[PDB]
Amino acid sequence: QQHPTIHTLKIETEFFKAVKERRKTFEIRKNDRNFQVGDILILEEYMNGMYLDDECEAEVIYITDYAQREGYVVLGIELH
Amino acid sequence: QHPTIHTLKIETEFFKAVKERRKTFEIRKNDRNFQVGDILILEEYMNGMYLDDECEAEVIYITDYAQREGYVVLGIELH
Numbered sequence: 001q002q003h004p005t006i007h008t009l010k011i012e013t014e015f016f017k018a019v020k021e022r023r024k025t026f027e028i029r030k031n032d033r034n035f036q037v038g039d040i041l042i043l044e045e046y047m048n049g050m051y052l053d054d055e056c057e058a059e060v061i062y063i064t065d066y067a068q069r070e071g072y073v074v075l076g077i078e079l080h
Numbered sequence: 081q082h083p084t085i086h087t088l089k090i091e092t093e094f095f096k097a098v099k100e101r102r103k104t105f106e107i108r109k110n111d112r113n114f115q116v117g118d119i120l121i122l123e124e125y126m127n128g129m130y131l132d133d134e135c136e137a138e139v140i141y142i143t144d145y146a147q148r149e150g151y152v153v154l155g156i157e158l159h
């Protein structure tokens with residue numbers, strides 16, 4: 001019944017911090033990965049072309065394309 | 081002074097998603113000069129009818145990343 005896809009994405013440090021702090025509870029992404037509610041994002045801290053070896057895991061709990069540019073979606077996320 | 085209180089209309093599908101904490105953001109034109117700390121009073125409507133319910137949320141985050149001109153995504157925290 002449930003088969004989430006795990007997506008591993010880079011996230012620039014400023015936004016990583018905002019997510020980890022639960023101030024930013026969504027991700028704005030091109031929908032080239034067929035994102036679905038229940039999917040898992042592994043958000044990997046990245047800065048100036050380097051992975052910084054910190055991450056956080058979040059579930060996609062809501063998706064919308066409302067008012068977005070072609071191909072973009074807003075993914076509502078719940079940090080684990 | 082105090083944080084601004086904005087009163088906005090929200091359709092029942094989205095109202096329900098906000099109340100359930102599934103939808104934790106609001107996509108809006110920024111013609112209100114929204115600021116972090118501001119309060120949104122979200123009033124429930126459906127197909128032009130006011131549905132005698134509402135909720136309150138704080139704007140905790142704001143971004144125009146990848147948005148159309150004048151648009152923002154407001155991160156909101158249900159009270």
Ligand SMILES: C[As](C)(=O)[O-]
Pocket residue numbers: 011012015016026027028029145
């Ligand atoms: C600016 As983003 C891709 O972390 O929503």
Ligand SMILES: C[As](C)(=O)[O-]
Pocket residue numbers: 066090091094105106107108
């Ligand atoms: C769809 As809305 C204006 O409640 O982000």
